[PDB]
Amino acid sequence: VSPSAFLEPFSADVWVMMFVMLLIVSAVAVFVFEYFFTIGKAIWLLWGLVFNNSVPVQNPKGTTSKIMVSVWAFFAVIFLASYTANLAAFMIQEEYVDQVSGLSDKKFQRPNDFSPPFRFGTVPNGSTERNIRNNYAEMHAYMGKFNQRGVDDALLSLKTGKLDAFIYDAAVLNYMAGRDEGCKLVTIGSGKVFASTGYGIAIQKDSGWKRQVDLAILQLFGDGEMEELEALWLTGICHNEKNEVMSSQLDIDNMAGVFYMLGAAMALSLITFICEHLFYWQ
Partner 1 sequence: QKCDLVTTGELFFRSGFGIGMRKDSPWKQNVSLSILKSHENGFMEDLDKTWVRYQECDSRSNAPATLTFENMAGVFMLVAGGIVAGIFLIFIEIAYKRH
Partner 2 sequence: EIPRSTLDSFMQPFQSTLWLLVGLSVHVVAVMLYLLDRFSTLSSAMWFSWGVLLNSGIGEGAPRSFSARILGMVWAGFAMIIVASYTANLAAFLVLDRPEERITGINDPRLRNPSDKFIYATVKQSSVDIY
Partner 3 sequence: VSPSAFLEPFSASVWVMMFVMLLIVSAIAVFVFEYFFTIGKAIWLLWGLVFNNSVPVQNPKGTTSKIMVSVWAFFAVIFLASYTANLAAFMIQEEFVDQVTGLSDKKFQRPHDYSPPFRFGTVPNGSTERNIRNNYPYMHQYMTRFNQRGVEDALVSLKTGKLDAFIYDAAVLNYKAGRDEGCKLVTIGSGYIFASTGYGIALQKGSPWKRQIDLALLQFVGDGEMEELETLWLTGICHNEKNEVMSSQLDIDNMAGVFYMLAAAMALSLITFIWEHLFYWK
Ligand X SMILES: O=C(O)[C@H]1CN(CCCP(=O)(O)O)CCN1
Q: Which amino acid is at 93?
A: Q
Q: Are 49 and 69 in contact (CB under 8 A)?
A: yes
Nearest distance from residue 90's CB to partner 3, in Å? Answer: 15
Burial 70-88 (b: 16+ CB within 10 A, else e): eebeebbeeeeeeeeeeee
The reply to whether 247 sits in an annotated binding site is no
Nearest distance from residue 201's CB to ligand X, in Å? Answer: 11
Of positions 58, 82, 84, 109, contacts partner 3 by CB under 8 A: 84
Q: Which amino acid is at 278?
A: L
Question: What CA–CA distance (Å, rounded) separates 72 from 59?
Answer: 13
Of positions 124, 178, 236, 257, contacts ligand NAG by CB under 6 A: 124
Question: What CA–CA distance (Å, rounded) separates 114 from 99?
Answer: 13
Nearest distance from residue 80's CB to partner 3, in Å? Answer: 11
125 binds ligand NAG (CB under 6 A): yes
Binding site partner of 225, from ligand NAG, partner 1, ligand X, none, Cβ cut-off 5-8 A by kind = none
Binding site partner of 195, from ligand X, partner 2, ligand NAG, none, Cβ cut-off 5-8 A by kind = none
268 binds partner 2 (CB under 8 A): yes
59 binds partner 2 (CB under 8 A): yes
The reply to whether 128 sits in an annotated binding site is yes
Q: Which is nearer to ligand X, 69 or 103 (CB)?
A: 103
The reply to whether 223 sits in an annotated binding site is no
Binding site partner of 9, from ligand X, ligand NAG, partner 1, none, Cβ cut-off 5-8 A by kind = partner 1
Q: Are 203 and 213 in contact (CB under 8 A)?
A: yes
Q: Helix 42-51 to helix 66-89 angle, to the nearest 10 degrees?
A: 40
**Which listed range, 17-25, 61-69, 126-134, 202-210, lies at the site for ligand X (CB under 6 A)?**
126-134
Q: Which is nearer to ligand NAG, 76 or 154 (CB)?
A: 154
Q: Are 183 and 175 in contact (CB under 8 A)?
A: no
Q: Which is nearer to ligand X, 136 or 168 (CB)?
A: 168
Question: What CA–CA distance (Å, rounded) separates 119 from 141?
Answer: 13
Question: What CA–CA distance (Å, rounded) separates 160 from 15?
Answer: 46
Of positions 169, 175, 236, 254, contacts ligand X by CB under 6 A: 169
Closest CA to 121 of 111, 174, 179: 111
Burial 6-35 (b: 16+ CB within 10 A, else e): beeebeeeeeeeeeeebeebbeebeeeeee
Binding-site ranges for partner 2 (CB under 8 A):
6, 40-41, 44, 47-49, 51-60, 66, 69-70, 72-74, 76-78, 80-92, 222, 236-238, 244, 246-247, 249-252, 255, 258, 261-262, 265-266, 268-269, 272-273, 276-277, 280
Binding residues for L-glutamate: 127-128, 169
